[PDB]
Amino acid sequence: TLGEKWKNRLNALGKSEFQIYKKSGIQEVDRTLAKEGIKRGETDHHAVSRGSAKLRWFVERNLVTPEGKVVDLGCGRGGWSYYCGGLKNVKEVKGLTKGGPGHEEPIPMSTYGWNLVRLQSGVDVFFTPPEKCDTLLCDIGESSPNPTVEAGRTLRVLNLVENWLNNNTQFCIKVLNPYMPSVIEKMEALQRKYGGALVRNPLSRNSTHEMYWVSNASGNIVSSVNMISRMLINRFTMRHKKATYEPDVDLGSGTRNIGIESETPNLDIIGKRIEKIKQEHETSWHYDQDHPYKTWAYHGSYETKQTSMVNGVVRLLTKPWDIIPMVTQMAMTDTTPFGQQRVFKEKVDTRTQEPKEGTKKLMKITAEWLWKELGKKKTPRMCTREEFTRKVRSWKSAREAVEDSGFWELVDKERNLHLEGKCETCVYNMMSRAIWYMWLGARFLEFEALGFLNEDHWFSRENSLSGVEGEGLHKLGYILRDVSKKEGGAMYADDTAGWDTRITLEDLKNEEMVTNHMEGEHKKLAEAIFKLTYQNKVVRVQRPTPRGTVMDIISRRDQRGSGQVVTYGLNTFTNMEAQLIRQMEGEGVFKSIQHLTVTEEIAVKNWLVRVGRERLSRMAISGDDCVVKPLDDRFASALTALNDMGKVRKDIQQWEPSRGWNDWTQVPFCSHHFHELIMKDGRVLVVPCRNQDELIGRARISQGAGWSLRETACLGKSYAQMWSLMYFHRRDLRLAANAICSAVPSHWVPTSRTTWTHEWMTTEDMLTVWNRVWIQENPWMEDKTPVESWEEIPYLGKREDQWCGSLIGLTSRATWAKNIQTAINQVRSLIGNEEYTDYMPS
Ligand SMILES: Nc1ncnc2c1ncn2[C@@H]1O[C@H](CSCC[C@H](N)C(=O)O)[C@@H](O)[C@H]1O
Ligand SMILES: Nc1ncnc2c1ncn2[C@@H]1O[C@H](CSCC[C@H](N)C(=O)O)[C@@H](O)[C@H]1O
Ligand SMILES: [Zn+2]
Numbered sequence: 001t002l003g004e005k006w007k008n009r010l011n012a013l014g015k016s017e018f019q020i021y022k023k024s025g026i027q028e029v030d031r032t033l034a035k036e037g038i039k040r041g042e043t044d045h046h047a048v049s050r051g052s053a054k055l056r057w058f059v060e061r062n063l064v065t066p067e068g069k070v071v072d073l074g075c076g077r078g079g080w081s082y083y084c085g086g087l088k089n090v091k092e093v094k095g096l097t098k099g100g101p102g103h104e105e106p107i108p109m110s111t112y113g114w115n116l117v118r119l120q121s122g123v124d125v126f127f128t129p130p131e132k133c134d135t136l137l138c139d140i141g142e143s144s145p146n147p148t149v150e151a152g153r154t155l156r157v158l159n160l161v162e163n164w165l166n167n168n169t170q171f172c173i174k175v176l177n178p179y180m181p182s183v184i185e186k187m188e189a190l191q192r193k194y195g196g197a198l199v200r201n202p203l204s205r206n207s208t209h210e211m212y213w214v215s216n217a218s219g220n221i222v223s224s225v226n227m228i229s230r231m232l233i234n235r236f237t238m239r240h241k242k243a244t245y246e247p248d249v250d251l252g253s254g255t256r257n258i259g260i261e262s263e264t265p266n267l268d269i270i271g272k273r274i275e276k277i278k279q280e281h282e283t284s285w286h287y288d289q290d291h292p293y294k295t296w297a298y299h300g301s302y303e304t305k306q307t308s309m310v311n312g313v314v315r316l317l318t319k320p321w322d323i324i325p326m327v328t329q330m331a332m333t334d335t336t337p338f339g340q341q342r343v344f345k346e347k348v349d350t351r352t353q354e355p356k357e358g359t360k361k362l363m364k365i366t367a368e369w370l371w372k373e374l375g376k377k378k379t380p381r382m383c384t385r386e387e388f389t390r391k392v393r394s395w396k397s398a399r400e401a402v403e404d405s406g407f408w409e410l411v412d413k414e415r416n417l418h419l420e421g422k423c424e425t426c427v428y429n430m431m432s433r434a435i436w437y438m439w440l441g442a443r444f445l446e447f448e449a450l451g452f453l454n455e456d457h458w459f460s461r462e463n464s465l466s467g468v469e470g471e472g473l474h475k476l477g478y479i480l481r482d483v484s485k486k487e488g489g490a491m492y493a494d495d496t497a498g499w500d501t502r503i504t505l506e507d508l509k510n511e512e513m514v515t516n517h518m519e520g521e522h523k524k525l526a527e528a529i530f531k532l533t534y535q536n537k538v539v540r541v542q543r544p545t546p547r548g549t550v551m552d553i554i555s556r557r558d559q560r561g562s563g564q565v566v567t568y569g570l571n572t573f574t575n576m577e578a579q580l581i582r583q584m585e586g587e588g589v590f591k592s593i594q595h596l597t598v599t600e601e602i603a604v605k606n607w608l609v610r611v612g613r614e615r616l617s618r619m620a621i622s623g624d625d626c627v628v629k630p631l632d633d634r635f636a637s638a639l640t641a642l643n644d645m646g647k648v649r650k651d652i653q654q655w656e657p658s659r660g661w662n663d664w665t666q667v668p669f670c671s672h673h674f675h676e677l678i679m680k681d682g683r684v685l686v687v688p689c690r691n692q693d694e695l696i697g698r699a700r701i702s703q704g705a706g707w708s709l710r711e712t713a714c715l716g717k718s719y720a721q722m723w724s725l726m727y728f729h730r731r732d733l734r735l736a737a738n739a740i741c742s743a744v745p746s747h748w749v750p751t752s753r754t755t756w757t758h759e760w761m762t763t764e765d766m767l768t769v770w771n772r773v774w775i776q777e778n779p780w781m782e783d784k785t786p787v788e789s790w791e792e793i794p795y796l797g798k799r800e801d802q803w804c805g806s807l808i809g810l811t812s813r814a815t816w817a818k819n820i821q822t823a824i825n826q827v828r829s830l831i832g833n834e835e836y837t838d839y840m841p842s
Pocket of ligand 3: 690804
């Protein structure tokens with residue numbers, strides 16, 4: 001007896017205990033999304049099974065390094081071989097599985113690398129001749145209540161991978177039951193010849209003793225097996241049987257081509273930049289060899305120390321949300337060791353097929369037209385350092401350094417160099433999302449060149465027709481409605497999968513055309529920004545090595561990296577361009593992306609001049625977020641130009657017609673939907689609204705360290721005064737907002753920062769600010785009669801409120817409301833003895 005002591009404890013165990021025990025303290029991956037998307041026909045990004053994740057756990061620790069020809073016996077739907085398709089050093093993948101009634105048939109998928117992946121069904125790998133291969137995977141092994149049975153099957157598959165192994169071969173072989181001495185004897189033999197060791201995957205459920213014979217591992221067999229046997233036993237009795245959740249594998253998209261992938265850098269530009277990082281180390285520096293990067297250019301690494309609080313005031317006043325998981329889990333921070341590297345390899349380590357010649361012309365003329373149209377009633381310019389320092393409204397405190405005078409001599413050095421045509425301190429530092437931090441000095445230069453776009457309001461709706469820059473949420477809704485009035489098809493709000501990684505080099509050269517309309521000292525500077533630091537970036541990213549974390553530095557030309565405040569401009573620009581070119585395609589201006597006939601290149605030019613402005617007004621565009629009401633619904637199939645520019649829509653098959661909204665109130669825009677609210681006096685309001693959990697959860701989270709109690713309480717007061725001015729139409733949030741203000745000293749000025757208009761920051765009475773923004777100043781309201789009690793401002797309907805997230809009618813919330821006064825005093829008592837107003841209605 002051994003781990004068989006485990007198996008009878010398990011076989012002798014009820015149905016529900018079994019399911020409880022199965023997923024206890026194990027690691028799981030959220031498959032709800034992929035499983036729903038694969039039914040809807042989405043044939044890329046998604047993994048086809050839990051298997052991809054499982055295998056990724058081995059690969060990212062180098063326990064298997066798949067490479068070359070990859071045979072995959074018992075490939076099932078394809079989880080392992082698809083995953084292997086996108087891996088760097090892999091050149092071919094063949095998957096063989098039985099298939100047939102009772103077994104899994106493979107799933108076809110446009111997953112990254114799929115072109116190198118041949119899955120065959122109707123194949124008994126026990127009956128087929130071996131083939132040359134450089135890495136061999138196998139995942140066969142039927143479990144059974146009976147341990148002797150499984151050793152049988154386990155030994156069968158062990159006797160099979162041996163025919164396929166050579167001695168240099170890489171492998172990952174499931175050992176269904178490694179605790180029987182039948183298997184413990186053969187595995188020792190096998191380990192003597194071919195090496196490796198058994199390794200347990202934490203994503204395996206507790207109901208199977210699977211261990212994987214993986215090539216690049218080492219260790220003693222019997223002990224490794226017994227370690228797992230007691231770990232699985234311990235877990236029968238485990239208190240706290242919740243399961244930890246990983247996000248699933250993002251398996252990419254599109255085909256793989258040895259020639260086309262891989263950056264050829266122009267080290268005559270990124271150069272003076274890298275060897276500077278080198279010198280700042282040169283000791284710990286080393287050119288790693290197993291670097292993961294496959295679409296970026298590697299250069300070297302160096303040591304680096306590996307690298308959100310709850311707001312008690314808000315939290316104490318939102319007690320019914322202490323058990324909603326979509327609220328309390330936003331405060332948790334998911335610091336897996338490979339978690340950053342995973343987002344990089346799946347989402348940023350991607351390439352985009354260069355557009356066709358005809359796409360490129362369409363873009364170049366539309367951009368050429370647009371930049372001119374944007375600059376009719378506007379003129380570029382540099383932006384002062386004093387102008388820059390002025391944003392002392394949010395060394396080691398960009399403020400403190402904004403005057404260390406030294407600073408401006410350092411910014412002064414490289415700035416001449418940009419004028420000569422080089423940089424040295426213009427590197428990005430990377431940190432589901434990525435943010436490309438940059439040196440506080442470098443962000444000056446780019447502000448001094450391109451600051452004018454975000455500072456003279458070039459994408460203001462009034463100046464660029466499609467923009468919504470500088471429009472509060474109390475206007476975007478009326479603006480969408482204004483578009484719905486336009487006569488045409490349905491409203492389309494397609495999102496792009498990972499927009500910034502989809503910026504092409506052509507995209508960047510097109511946007512650089514704003515330097516046409518510049519000239520002088522200025523132009524040369526805004527030429528360096530574009531050419532030197534936008535089209536030719538160098539980046540630092542951390543990465544975990546078996547020698548401890550290192551900071552690789554890599555470089556890539558493609559994609560959008562820049563100041564999150566400057567990229568907004570260009571993203572709107574190019575998206576405006578892209579949505580125009582799509583509108584064309586639907587209307588029929590041009591008919592092929594490969595060539596633009598001279599007589600079509602004219603139609604494009606005409607249309608642009610004859611209706612271009614009108615087409616722009618059919619669009620609400622904020623960066624990659626867009627809303628389009630075109631002439632007819634032929635827009636919903638005009639996908640050739642969209643796809644070829646790289647702006648691949650998110651969450652449907654590449655050539656699936658887009659779905660249009662026939663009710664603007666459901667059109668998602670700027671992370672909100674907008675309801676149409678009618679007062680008791682019958683004036684109509686268009687109000688912003690979103691899942692109320694993302695609102696509560698946001699408000700209960702604090703930025704940074706050192707928040708005192710007076711700050712923590714003024715941050716909550718910001719969130720509350722914002723709720724009552726924007727989300728006043730939701731019961732919970734207006735109650736919670738009133739509670740917060742009754743519990744924070746009424747004389748304290750809210751100061752902090754909510755999101756990214758901010759009328760809720762005044763210390764005025766909120767009802768006054770309400771009347772200003774919603775009545776005496778929105779244009780969509782001609783009757784300027786003031787409302788003089790909160791009992792005049794309306795709510796959504798009950799059913800809408802609880803649909804958009806409310807808790808009204810749940811007993812816990814009802815209890816929260818009867819006692820809100822007890823809660824306000826808990827917090828007031830905590831704050832101390834100050835002057836409090838009482839906003840709660842009776
Ligand atoms: N004799 C045989 N020949 C080929 N495939 C077999 C087989 N016996 C079982 N299999 C198949 O092997 C698969 C292993 S489970 C496959 C999961 C896979 N690793 C993934 O990532 O998706 C099962 O679908 C089973 O049908
Ligand atoms: N953060 C961590 N904490 C504890 N163990 C870790 C770890 N990260 C990795 N490991 C373990 O360290 C191992 C590195 S695998 C090393 C394989 C090696 N390249 C060879 O050729 O033999 C993984 O198996 C994992 O089990
Ligand atoms: Zn709503």
